C-alpha cells in the first residue's frame, strides 16, 4: 500500500468518529459537576474514617 | 445361535471360534444374545457363514480373554483405553469398572511426569524423630529436615525443635476431581482459610 | 490522497471539540469555594508493616473484602496477605519475573497476573484440594501486560502494550473486544463502579475512556504531556484522577469532557505513580516516586498531608473498598497499612 | 453407496471389515468417497473383493477408532506423528487438532533439553510455613528450606524465619528471547535493576 | 505381481500392497527398477509375482512411509539405527541424512555418560537473594543454599550471610579433560596457586 | 580462571574471558526474566 502509506486512513476514520461522538455527548458545565462532587463528598464525610478517626477496636485496621 | 457350540464370529474380519459358555459367562453381554436365536439379529456374512461384529479385533483380544477366563492382562503396547471402549460395546460392567481402575492407576503414574508433587510438613522432637523417619508412610519420600532453635524447653528435646518435610507425587489412582459444587464444603473452605 | 480530507476533517473536529470544552468551561466552583469543610492535617500512623517480600513490590491491589490484598513483587511472587493477622494466605510464584499487575477478582476466588511475560495468567484460588491451581494462561497479547481487571470471573479486560487493552473471555482464551487508537502503550486500566466503561492511560499522555462491550473510544481526555501511570475512578465513576511522570495530577470529568481541576505543587518535583479515591472521594491519595506518598484535599487542591516514613518510593497505592485504610506498594519490600 | 451396509477395505493389504456408517460419520474424507460409486473408482480385489487403498494399516487403527467411537486412542508404539499425517491424508480436521495438541503438550514438556528450571524464594514464618507448603501452588516443587534467624527477638517469633526456595521446570519463553521489547519495558527493567 | 495399479511386495514374508507410483516417487529407491518391466527378478513368488525382497518388514515401514508421501516418521519402538541401515540398503540419501540428523540430535540432547557438573558459589545476603535466584543464569540449576555462621551485623541483614551454590552439567563437552595448555597460562596458574 | 570482565558500552551486555580460550558474551537485559548466555567465541588455542 503506497496510496495511503500503510492504510493510515483507518486511524483517521476512527479519529474522526471518536471526535464526532465526543461532540455528540452533552457538555455539563464545570461548576455543576464541581458542586455535585462537593455534595457527594460532604454527604459521605461522616462515613470516611480517614476524615473521622474511629476507636482502635471499633475498626479492624487498628487491630 | 443354535448350532456349532464353537460359534465362529468375524470380529473385525477375524474369525474368533469361541464356545457358547465363555460368552454366556456374563449375560449382560451383547454376545450372550448372539449365543441364542433372536429375530431382530440380521447381521451376517454370507461368505463364511459367520455373523458380523464391526469392531476391531485388536482390542477384542483382551476383552475375550477376560470374558473367557474371568481376568484380562493388556499388553504393554496396547491402549487400555481402546480395550475399555471396545468393552462397553458388549456391556460387561465389571470388566469396564476394573479397566477404569487400571486406567486411572496408570494415569496416576503418568501424572508424575507433569511437575505435580504433594508436600507435607511434620514436626518432631529429637527422640521420636527417627521413629517416623523409619516407619513413615510407604510411597512417599523424605525431602528436608530443619532444626529450629527453641526457648520453650530450650533447644534439644523440644517438640518444635525439628521440622521434617516429606513429599510424594500427585496421583489420581481411584479418580481425580477438580471441584465439588456442594456449598457447605465451600463455606468450610472459606472459614478455614482465616 | 483521501488523507487530505481526513487530516482536514480531524482538525476542524478537534478544533470544535476544544471549543466545545471551552464552551463548557466555567470557573471551578470547588477551588473557588473555601467554605467547604477542611480535612485538616493527616499525619496518620501506619498500623501494619506487612514485611515478607524480598523484592520491590510493583503493584498492590485490595480485594473486595478489604482484608486480603494481593501484592506483586519484582521477582515474580504474589503474596495474598492478610492485613489483620499479617499472615500469607497464599504465595503464587510465576513462570516469569517482572509482574506488575495483581488483579484480584471481585469475589476472592480468582487472581490475575501479568508483566513482561506478555501472557496474562489467571489463577483459581479455590480448587478441589484447596491450594492454588492455575486456571488459564491467556495468550494473545503482543505487548507486555500493564494492568488487568476482572469484570466477570470468566471475562477480563487486560490492558497491555502494543497499543491494545482488549478484553478476553477466560475459558476460550480469545480476545473478545479489541481496543485500538493509542499511540503509546497502555499503562492504566481504571474501572468505574458501573463496570460498563473503562478509562486507560498510556505513554501518549491521552486518557482514552472506552465503552467495554462496544470497542469504541467514548472519550479521549488530554491534559498531560507525559506517560500516564495510574488512574483511579471516583466511587461515583463520573470523574477520575490522572497521574503522570510530572509534578502534577489532574481530575478529568466524563460529563464535562474536560479537566475539572488539577492537583499541582512546586513543593514536589517527582512523578505521580499511583492515585486513589477514598469512600467519600474527598481525599485524593497519591503515591509518589519521592520516598513518601501524599494525600491532597481533592476539593481544595492543597496537600492535606504526607504519609512520611518510607525510605524507598511508593511504587503503588491502594485504598480499601470500605474507603478507610490504604496500603503502599513501596520499594522497601514493605507494605504499610496507613490507618 | 454401491454395496450392502457392511464393507471391506484393503488398507495396505489388511482387510478392515466395517459398516459404512462408521465411515460416513464425517462426510468429508477419503473413506467417504470410497463408499459411494463414481467413474473415478475401479478399486476392488481380484480374490474376494475389497476397495484398494495403499495406506498404512499400522496408522489406520486410531484413525478408524476416531470414527467408530468418535475418539482417538494413542498406543504406546504407534507414534502421534504417524496418526497425525494419516489423519491429514483423510482430512479429519478435529482429529488432527487433537493429535497436534497432544504432540505440543509432550514436546513442550520434554523438549526442554536445559529444562530451564525457574527458581523462587518465598519468605515465610513457622506458622504460615505449614499452610503454604501444604497449600503449595500446583506446578512447582519445593527444593530447599533455609532457616534464618529472626531479625527481632532471638531466632523465631518473627515473620522472617524461613526461606522456602521452590522451583519448577519450564520452557523459559515461547520465544526463547526478548521478542521486541518496548521502550517502556526497557525503562522499567532499568528502574528495577536497582 | 504388477497386476493393476498396485504391486505385491514380499518384504520379509510380509506382502505389502503398494502403489507403483509410490515406488516411482524417486529413482533413489531401487524399487523403481522393480516397478518397471525389464528382464530380471528371477526369484519371485511363482503364484502371483510377489518379489521376494529379504529385508526387515519393520524397518521398511518408515522407509515406505517417507516414500509414499515425502514425510518421515519413525516408530517409537523401532530403533532409528535400523531405519538408518534400511535406508542405506534402499539408498535414499535424503532419508539417510534425516535419520542421521535425528540420531545426532537425540544423542547430543542426552550426551552425558558419568554426568559432569561445574559448581559455583554465589556469596550474597537475604536482601538481593531472590534477585540472583530469579536472575539465575539459564541452563544452571540451584542446588543448595547455606547461611554463613557469623556474629557480625547481628547475623541478620549481614552483607555476608549466605552462600548459594549452582551447578551446570558437563561431559556434554568437558573442559577439564580437554587440555591445550599455554606456557604463560601455566605460569599464571602457578602464580594464582602460590 | 577468568581474568577479563568486559562491560558493554551501553551496559546491556557483558563479556568475560579466561584460560578456557572461549569468550563469553551474556545478554544481560531480556524480558525472559533472567540472564542468558548470548554467544560463546572459540578459535584460539591460547587464553583470552
Tab-separated table of N, CA, C and O in Angstrom, chain B residues 27-94:
chain	number	residue	atom	x	y	z
B	27	UNK	N	-24.362	-62.709	30.969
B	27	UNK	CA	-25.472	-62.486	30.044
B	27	UNK	C	-25.623	-60.993	29.736
B	27	UNK	O	-26.098	-60.661	28.670
B	28	UNK	N	-25.154	-60.132	30.639
B	28	UNK	CA	-25.185	-58.673	30.361
B	28	UNK	C	-24.388	-58.390	29.084
B	28	UNK	O	-24.209	-57.202	28.760
B	29	UNK	N	-23.951	-59.431	28.370
B	29	UNK	CA	-23.067	-59.196	27.197
B	29	UNK	C	-23.823	-59.213	25.870
B	29	UNK	O	-24.612	-60.146	25.643
B	30	UNK	N	-23.584	-58.204	25.035
B	30	UNK	CA	-24.152	-58.175	23.694
B	30	UNK	C	-24.039	-59.546	23.036
B	30	UNK	O	-24.953	-59.991	22.332
B	31	UNK	N	-22.916	-60.232	23.260
B	31	UNK	CA	-22.668	-61.517	22.612
B	31	UNK	C	-23.503	-62.641	23.216
B	31	UNK	O	-23.794	-63.630	22.528
B	32	UNK	N	-23.870	-62.528	24.496
B	32	UNK	CA	-24.730	-63.535	25.113
B	32	UNK	C	-26.025	-63.691	24.331
B	32	UNK	O	-26.548	-64.802	24.181
B	33	UNK	N	-26.557	-62.579	23.825
B	33	UNK	CA	-27.734	-62.624	22.971
B	33	UNK	C	-27.438	-63.289	21.634
B	33	UNK	O	-28.331	-63.898	21.038
B	34	UNK	N	-26.200	-63.184	21.145
B	34	UNK	CA	-25.845	-63.880	19.914
B	34	UNK	C	-25.680	-65.376	20.140
B	34	UNK	O	-25.793	-66.157	19.188
B	35	UNK	N	-25.410	-65.789	21.380
B	35	UNK	CA	-25.372	-67.217	21.687
B	35	UNK	C	-26.730	-67.875	21.475
B	35	UNK	O	-26.808	-69.103	21.347
B	36	UNK	N	-27.801	-67.087	21.444
B	36	UNK	CA	-29.155	-67.582	21.267
B	36	UNK	C	-29.788	-66.954	20.032
B	36	UNK	O	-29.339	-65.915	19.542
B	37	UNK	N	-30.824	-67.610	19.518
B	37	UNK	CA	-31.528	-67.106	18.351
B	37	UNK	C	-32.494	-65.992	18.738
B	37	UNK	O	-33.182	-66.063	19.761
B	38	UNK	N	-32.532	-64.952	17.909
B	38	UNK	CA	-33.452	-63.835	18.072
B	38	UNK	C	-33.705	-63.234	16.700
B	38	UNK	O	-32.794	-63.208	15.863
B	39	UNK	N	-34.919	-62.736	16.436
B	39	UNK	CA	-35.294	-62.411	15.053
B	39	UNK	C	-34.809	-61.057	14.558
B	39	UNK	O	-34.692	-60.854	13.346
B	40	UNK	N	-34.520	-60.122	15.468
B	40	UNK	CA	-34.026	-58.814	15.041
B	40	UNK	C	-32.606	-58.917	14.510
B	40	UNK	O	-32.206	-58.144	13.631
B	41	UNK	N	-31.830	-59.859	15.038
B	41	UNK	CA	-30.449	-60.017	14.606
B	41	UNK	C	-30.401	-60.478	13.153
B	41	UNK	O	-30.725	-61.628	12.838
B	42	UNK	N	-29.979	-59.576	12.270
B	42	UNK	CA	-29.849	-59.860	10.846
B	42	UNK	C	-28.499	-59.352	10.358
B	42	UNK	O	-28.356	-58.856	9.240
B	43	UNK	N	-27.486	-59.477	11.211
B	43	UNK	CA	-26.122	-59.079	10.892
B	43	UNK	C	-25.324	-60.342	10.625
B	43	UNK	O	-25.083	-61.134	11.543
B	44	UNK	N	-24.925	-60.537	9.371
B	44	UNK	CA	-24.296	-61.786	8.975
B	44	UNK	C	-23.359	-61.535	7.807
B	44	UNK	O	-23.486	-60.547	7.079
B	45	UNK	N	-22.411	-62.449	7.647
B	45	UNK	CA	-21.577	-62.533	6.460
B	45	UNK	C	-21.855	-63.860	5.774
B	45	UNK	O	-21.692	-64.926	6.377
B	46	UNK	N	-22.278	-63.794	4.515
B	46	UNK	CA	-22.654	-64.981	3.761
B	46	UNK	C	-21.494	-65.550	2.957
B	46	UNK	O	-21.693	-66.488	2.177
B	47	UNK	N	-20.292	-65.008	3.129
B	47	UNK	CA	-19.089	-65.564	2.530
B	47	UNK	C	-18.399	-66.573	3.439
B	47	UNK	O	-17.552	-67.337	2.968
B	48	UNK	N	-18.740	-66.590	4.728
B	48	UNK	CA	-18.146	-67.538	5.662
B	48	UNK	C	-19.191	-68.092	6.622
B	48	UNK	O	-18.866	-68.890	7.508
B	49	UNK	N	-20.447	-67.679	6.453
B	49	UNK	CA	-21.497	-68.110	7.355
B	49	UNK	C	-21.315	-67.673	8.789
B	49	UNK	O	-21.931	-68.253	9.686
B	50	UNK	N	-20.486	-66.660	9.032
B	50	UNK	CA	-20.202	-66.172	10.373
B	50	UNK	C	-20.784	-64.777	10.530
B	50	UNK	O	-20.721	-63.962	9.606
B	51	UNK	N	-21.349	-64.509	11.702
B	51	UNK	CA	-22.040	-63.251	11.922
B	51	UNK	C	-21.030	-62.121	12.115
B	51	UNK	O	-19.858	-62.346	12.431
B	52	UNK	N	-21.502	-60.893	11.923
B	52	UNK	CA	-20.631	-59.728	11.839
B	52	UNK	C	-20.685	-58.914	13.124
B	52	UNK	O	-21.770	-58.614	13.634
B	53	UNK	N	-19.510	-58.564	13.642
B	53	UNK	CA	-19.357	-57.611	14.737
B	53	UNK	C	-18.349	-56.582	14.242
B	53	UNK	O	-17.136	-56.804	14.323
B	54	UNK	N	-18.842	-55.452	13.732
B	54	UNK	CA	-17.995	-54.474	13.050
B	54	UNK	C	-17.211	-53.655	14.078
B	54	UNK	O	-17.284	-52.426	14.144
B	55	UNK	N	-16.421	-54.375	14.871
B	55	UNK	CA	-15.499	-53.778	15.825
B	55	UNK	C	-14.138	-54.424	15.628
B	55	UNK	O	-14.035	-55.588	15.233
B	56	UNK	N	-13.090	-53.657	15.919
B	56	UNK	CA	-11.739	-54.116	15.640
B	56	UNK	C	-11.384	-55.335	16.491
B	56	UNK	O	-11.839	-55.467	17.630
B	57	UNK	N	-10.580	-56.255	15.950
B	57	UNK	CA	-10.110	-57.388	16.754
B	57	UNK	C	-8.850	-57.088	17.542
B	57	UNK	O	-8.433	-57.925	18.354
B	58	UNK	N	-8.236	-55.924	17.329
B	58	UNK	CA	-7.019	-55.577	18.052
B	58	UNK	C	-7.290	-55.400	19.544
B	58	UNK	O	-6.461	-55.774	20.381
B	59	UNK	N	-8.442	-54.830	19.904
B	59	UNK	CA	-8.805	-54.720	21.311
B	59	UNK	C	-9.821	-55.769	21.746
B	59	UNK	O	-10.088	-55.888	22.948
B	60	UNK	N	-10.390	-56.526	20.805
B	60	UNK	CA	-11.265	-57.641	21.150
B	60	UNK	C	-10.517	-58.765	21.853
B	60	UNK	O	-11.145	-59.575	22.544
B	61	UNK	N	-9.197	-58.828	21.694
B	61	UNK	CA	-8.390	-59.866	22.289
B	61	UNK	C	-8.454	-59.903	23.803
B	61	UNK	O	-8.850	-60.910	24.395
B	62	UNK	N	-8.027	-58.821	24.463
B	62	UNK	CA	-8.117	-58.783	25.933
B	62	UNK	C	-9.535	-58.912	26.458
B	62	UNK	O	-9.742	-59.499	27.529
B	63	UNK	N	-10.520	-58.371	25.739
B	63	UNK	CA	-11.909	-58.498	26.172
B	63	UNK	C	-12.323	-59.963	26.173
B	63	UNK	O	-12.889	-60.468	27.151
B	64	UNK	N	-12.032	-60.668	25.080
B	64	UNK	CA	-12.341	-62.090	25.008
B	64	UNK	C	-11.547	-62.883	26.037
B	64	UNK	O	-12.053	-63.865	26.581
B	65	UNK	N	-10.314	-62.459	26.329
B	65	UNK	CA	-9.511	-63.132	27.346
B	65	UNK	C	-10.163	-63.034	28.718
B	65	UNK	O	-10.346	-64.049	29.407
B	66	UNK	N	-10.517	-61.815	29.130
B	66	UNK	CA	-11.225	-61.629	30.391
B	66	UNK	C	-12.512	-62.437	30.413
B	66	UNK	O	-12.805	-63.132	31.391
B	67	UNK	N	-13.293	-62.362	29.337
B	67	UNK	CA	-14.614	-62.968	29.347
B	67	UNK	C	-14.506	-64.492	29.370
B	67	UNK	O	-15.365	-65.160	29.954
B	68	UNK	N	-13.449	-65.044	28.770
B	68	UNK	CA	-13.237	-66.486	28.768
B	68	UNK	C	-12.743	-66.978	30.122
B	68	UNK	O	-13.214	-68.005	30.626
B	69	UNK	N	-11.787	-66.271	30.726
B	69	UNK	CA	-11.145	-66.775	31.939
B	69	UNK	C	-11.176	-65.730	33.052
B	69	UNK	O	-10.231	-65.587	33.829
B	70	UNK	N	-12.282	-64.992	33.142
B	70	UNK	CA	-12.554	-64.105	34.261
B	70	UNK	C	-11.443	-63.162	34.677
B	70	UNK	O	-11.428	-62.684	35.814
B	71	UNK	N	-10.516	-62.874	33.762
B	71	UNK	CA	-9.412	-61.964	34.042
B	71	UNK	C	-8.683	-61.625	32.750
B	71	UNK	O	-8.528	-62.485	31.877
B	72	UNK	N	-8.224	-60.386	32.620
B	72	UNK	CA	-7.510	-59.939	31.436
B	72	UNK	C	-6.178	-59.317	31.828
B	72	UNK	O	-6.012	-58.764	32.918
B	73	UNK	N	-5.225	-59.423	30.910
B	73	UNK	CA	-3.956	-58.714	31.001
B	73	UNK	C	-3.726	-58.023	29.667
B	73	UNK	O	-3.598	-58.687	28.633
B	74	UNK	N	-3.681	-56.705	29.686
B	74	UNK	CA	-3.462	-55.929	28.473
B	74	UNK	C	-1.969	-55.886	28.195
B	74	UNK	O	-1.145	-55.882	29.115
B	75	UNK	N	-1.613	-55.864	26.915
B	75	UNK	CA	-0.210	-55.787	26.551
B	75	UNK	C	0.354	-54.421	26.935
B	75	UNK	O	-0.378	-53.445	27.123
B	76	UNK	N	1.676	-54.355	27.049
B	76	UNK	CA	2.350	-53.114	27.399
B	76	UNK	C	2.545	-52.206	26.193
B	76	UNK	O	3.222	-51.177	26.305
B	77	UNK	N	1.966	-52.566	25.049
B	77	UNK	CA	1.962	-51.732	23.859
B	77	UNK	C	0.557	-51.424	23.361
B	77	UNK	O	0.409	-50.678	22.386
B	78	UNK	N	-0.473	-51.963	24.007
B	78	UNK	CA	-1.854	-51.827	23.566
B	78	UNK	C	-2.594	-50.910	24.529
B	78	UNK	O	-2.422	-51.015	25.748
B	79	UNK	N	-3.417	-50.019	23.979
B	79	UNK	CA	-4.066	-48.984	24.777
B	79	UNK	C	-5.128	-49.586	25.689
B	79	UNK	O	-6.037	-50.283	25.229
B	80	UNK	N	-5.011	-49.309	26.989
B	80	UNK	CA	-6.073	-49.664	27.924
B	80	UNK	C	-7.381	-48.974	27.554
B	80	UNK	O	-8.467	-49.541	27.730
B	81	UNK	N	-7.294	-47.747	27.030
B	81	UNK	CA	-8.491	-47.012	26.636
B	81	UNK	C	-9.233	-47.722	25.512
B	81	UNK	O	-10.469	-47.757	25.498
B	82	UNK	N	-8.496	-48.267	24.542
B	82	UNK	CA	-9.138	-49.000	23.464
B	82	UNK	C	-9.833	-50.258	23.947
B	82	UNK	O	-10.933	-50.588	23.493
B	83	UNK	N	-9.198	-50.984	24.869
B	83	UNK	CA	-9.857	-52.144	25.455
B	83	UNK	C	-11.121	-51.707	26.174
B	83	UNK	O	-12.167	-52.352	26.054
B	84	UNK	N	-11.066	-50.580	26.881
B	84	UNK	CA	-12.242	-50.079	27.585
B	84	UNK	C	-13.380	-49.762	26.609
B	84	UNK	O	-14.522	-50.222	26.786
B	85	UNK	N	-13.074	-48.998	25.554
B	85	UNK	CA	-14.107	-48.577	24.609
B	85	UNK	C	-14.695	-49.768	23.862
B	85	UNK	O	-15.904	-49.805	23.605
B	86	UNK	N	-13.868	-50.756	23.511
B	86	UNK	CA	-14.423	-51.999	22.990
B	86	UNK	C	-15.240	-52.717	24.055
B	86	UNK	O	-16.169	-53.465	23.725
B	87	UNK	N	-14.926	-52.484	25.331
B	87	UNK	CA	-15.607	-53.193	26.406
B	87	UNK	C	-17.064	-52.770	26.536
B	87	UNK	O	-17.949	-53.630	26.601
B	88	UNK	N	-17.354	-51.458	26.588
B	88	UNK	CA	-18.779	-51.131	26.778
B	88	UNK	C	-19.651	-51.550	25.603
B	88	UNK	O	-20.861	-51.718	25.787
B	89	UNK	N	-19.085	-51.726	24.405
B	89	UNK	CA	-19.929	-52.072	23.264
B	89	UNK	C	-20.603	-53.421	23.467
B	89	UNK	O	-21.647	-53.690	22.864
B	90	UNK	N	-20.024	-54.274	24.308
B	90	UNK	CA	-20.643	-55.531	24.701
B	90	UNK	C	-21.262	-55.471	26.090
B	90	UNK	O	-21.924	-56.427	26.500
B	91	UNK	N	-21.040	-54.373	26.818
B	91	UNK	CA	-21.761	-54.042	28.046
B	91	UNK	C	-21.470	-54.997	29.202
B	91	UNK	O	-22.398	-55.496	29.845
B	92	UNK	N	-20.195	-55.259	29.474
B	92	UNK	CA	-19.777	-56.027	30.644
B	92	UNK	C	-19.327	-55.022	31.699
B	92	UNK	O	-18.231	-54.462	31.615
B	93	UNK	N	-20.170	-54.810	32.714
B	93	UNK	CA	-19.955	-53.714	33.656
B	93	UNK	C	-18.712	-53.928	34.511
B	93	UNK	O	-17.905	-53.006	34.683
B	94	UNK	N	-18.551	-55.128	35.075
B	94	UNK	CA	-17.429	-55.383	35.973
B	94	UNK	C	-16.098	-55.217	35.252
B	94	UNK	O	-15.152	-54.628	35.797
